[PDB]
Design a protein around this ligand. Structure first.
Ligand SMILES: COC(=O)c1ccc(OC(=O)c2ccc([N+](=O)[O-])o2)c(OC)c1
Ligand SMILES: [Mn+2]
Ligand SMILES: [Mn+2]
Ligand SMILES: [Zn+2]
Ligand SMILES: [Zn+2]
Length: 145
């Protein structure tokens, strides 16, 4: 492949819980992260979509992290489109996606700069863990929780 994502989390490395949220009626949205070393960032966006904000959040996690990074997302699409891009690069049966192609290409360029990346999906869920904290932050003023 272009790259090999980790098969289990990287012990000792900082973990970024990413999320994004958008509203279809206004195309306003937010993307961000909270980490297990007490970092957080939330950005407000215009002209966006839910899939775009989930991807943007991963982009911020890659931009702001060290060379080894754990990333937990609740977006099956974001995980799938990134993993598929890595697995099929420069190979025969690859047609590049049309939707979000510029943003995914920006993410891949950041990804291959890292030493090790662990990227994993969890279903959205309630509680007081990491995914639930960032979900509240990106949902504020974007939709009812
Ligand atoms: C602010 O309104 C929103 O658009 C919004 C979007 C996502 C939210 O939670 C998630 O991250 C999420 C839900 C479903 C998925 N998913 O990947 O199928 O992810 C959310 O929780 C209140 C609100
Ligand atoms: Mn989400
Ligand atoms: Mn969420
Ligand atoms: Zn606009
Ligand atoms: Zn290292």
């Amino acid at each position: 492949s272009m790259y090999q994502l980790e098969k289990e989390p990287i012990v000792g490395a900082e973990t970024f819980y990413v999320d994004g949220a958008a509203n279809r009626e206004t195309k306003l949205g937010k993307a961000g992260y909270v980490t297990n070393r007490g970092r957080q960032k939330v950005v407000t966006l215009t002209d966006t979509t839910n899939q775009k904000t989930e991807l943007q959040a991963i982009y911020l996690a890659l931009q702001d992290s060290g060379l080894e990074v754990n990333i937990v997302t609740d977006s099956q699409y974001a995980l799938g489109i990134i993993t598929q891009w890595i697995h099929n690069w420069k190979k025969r049966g690859w047609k590049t996606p049309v939707k979000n192609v510029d943003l995914v290409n920006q993410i891949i360029e950041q990804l291959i700069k890292k030493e090790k990346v662990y990227l994993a999906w969890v279903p959205a869920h309630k509680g007081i863990g990491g995914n639930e904290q960032v979900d509240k932050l990106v949902s504020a003023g974007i939709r009812k929780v």
